[PDB]
Amino acid sequence: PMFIVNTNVPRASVPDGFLSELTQQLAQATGKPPQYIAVHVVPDQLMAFGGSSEPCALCSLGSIGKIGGAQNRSYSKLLCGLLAERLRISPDRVYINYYDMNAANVGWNNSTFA
Amino acid sequence: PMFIVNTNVPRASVPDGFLSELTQQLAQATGKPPQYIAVHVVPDQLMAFGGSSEPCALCSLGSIGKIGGAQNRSYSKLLCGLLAERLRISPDRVYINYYDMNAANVGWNNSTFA
Amino acid sequence: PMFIVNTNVPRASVPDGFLSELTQQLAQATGKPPQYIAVHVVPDQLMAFGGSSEPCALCSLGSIGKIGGAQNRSYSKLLCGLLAERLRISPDRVYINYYDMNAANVGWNNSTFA
């Protein structure tokens, strides 16, 4: 899995341990081993949500499988909860694009997962 | 909808009001209310387009529906016009990836849009 | 084609000529002219791979065609090779998302490639 968060919250507002917390929680939610989880947080961004520059986040979660209606609702509750608790971002100012990657379309370790 | 522009144009060259201008124009173009439009501008990037580093932009526009051949041509004229007028980027140095998201694959407010 | 590399390697560790090297190698690999190759490198990122903040990279390669099982394995060997040799990133700490864009979903020069 690959989880990317882009946010206008400043870097100093991202707590220490946040990437680890995301890695651990995504491993448990997706069922994937933690060694395959990649996380990326980009603060201090120039963005707006609904025309407003109040705290917001634009994110994406890609995975080879483990993407679907029920699973994605569960991931949204988890990830919006973490963004609210740790970055003080309201859940209604968060978008998460979920995408299911074919194993043949994911490069890793000089090859693909197909 | 979610619009992202990554550019090598410096931050000081992004005019005041640009995010609001993008939010308004994308609300009119997609027909979606401005409260549902998210915009993200990332200046000062290290990029090249066609092997050169004159001003350029790599962008994406995601929407739940409102994505198609004719609509995408209209969006390109609008967004290339805005990038040329406000950031002085030639339209032939702009790529925009359009993507149609399923509602069940977009997380927002602790759930999805399904 | 559009190639983006996001990495925690510092900016000073990106060699001069890297964008040109990626442009030429991707033009040769995809068979497309270098004039249509866009490259984007984002260093100094707050990211983890497998819970670790050792050097890593999260990348994507989009193209209108030239995406498939065998081609992607070849691209992965090429791009992991360049990231290892030029940025000192281990190939097992690199993910590359390959995506095949429809020409009508790629905006350029006030229209699309359809």
The structural domains of chain C, with segments of one domain joined by +, span: 1-114
- Resolution of the deposited coordinates, in angstroms? 1.5
Q: Which of C2, C11, C112 sits opposite B58 (nearest CB)?
A: C2
Tell me the residue type at B33: P
Q: How many CB pairs under 8 A join A and B?
A: 97
Q: CB distance B51–C40 less than 8 Å?
A: no
C83 → chain A, closest CA residue: A110
| B54 at interface of C, judged by CB pairs closer than 8 A | no
Identify the burial level of B90 via C-beta atoms within 10 angstroms of its C-beta, where 0-12 means exposed, 13-18 middle and 19 or more buried. middle
| C94 at interface of A, judged by CB pairs closer than 8 A | yes
Tell me the residue type at B87: L
Q: Which residues contact C93 (CB under 8 A, 6 or more apart)?
A: C49, C50, C52, C54, C55, C56, C57
Is A10 known to be catalytic? Answer: no
Is C44 within 8 Å of C6 (Cβ atoms)? no
Name the minimum distance, in Å, from the CA of A76 to any CA of chain B. Answer: 5
B1-114: in CATH 3.40.640.10: no
Is A92 within 8 Å of A50 (Cβ atoms)? no
Name the experimental technique: X-ray
Identify the burial level of A3 via C-beta atoms within 10 angstroms of its C-beta, where 0-12 means exposed, 13-18 middle and 19 or more buried. buried
CA distance linking residue C62 with residue C66, whole number of Å: 9
Give the annotated binding-site residues of B: 32, 64, 97
* Residue A86 CB neighbours (<10 A): 16
| C97 at interface of A, judged by CB pairs closer than 8 A | yes
CA distance linking residue B96 with residue C112, whole number of Å: 9
CA distance linking residue A42 with residue C45, whole number of Å: 7
Mutate to test the interface with A, among C26, C76, C83 (most CBs of A within 10 A): C76
- Of the candidates C35, C41, C49, C32, the one whose C-alpha atom is nearest the C-alpha of residue C3 is C41
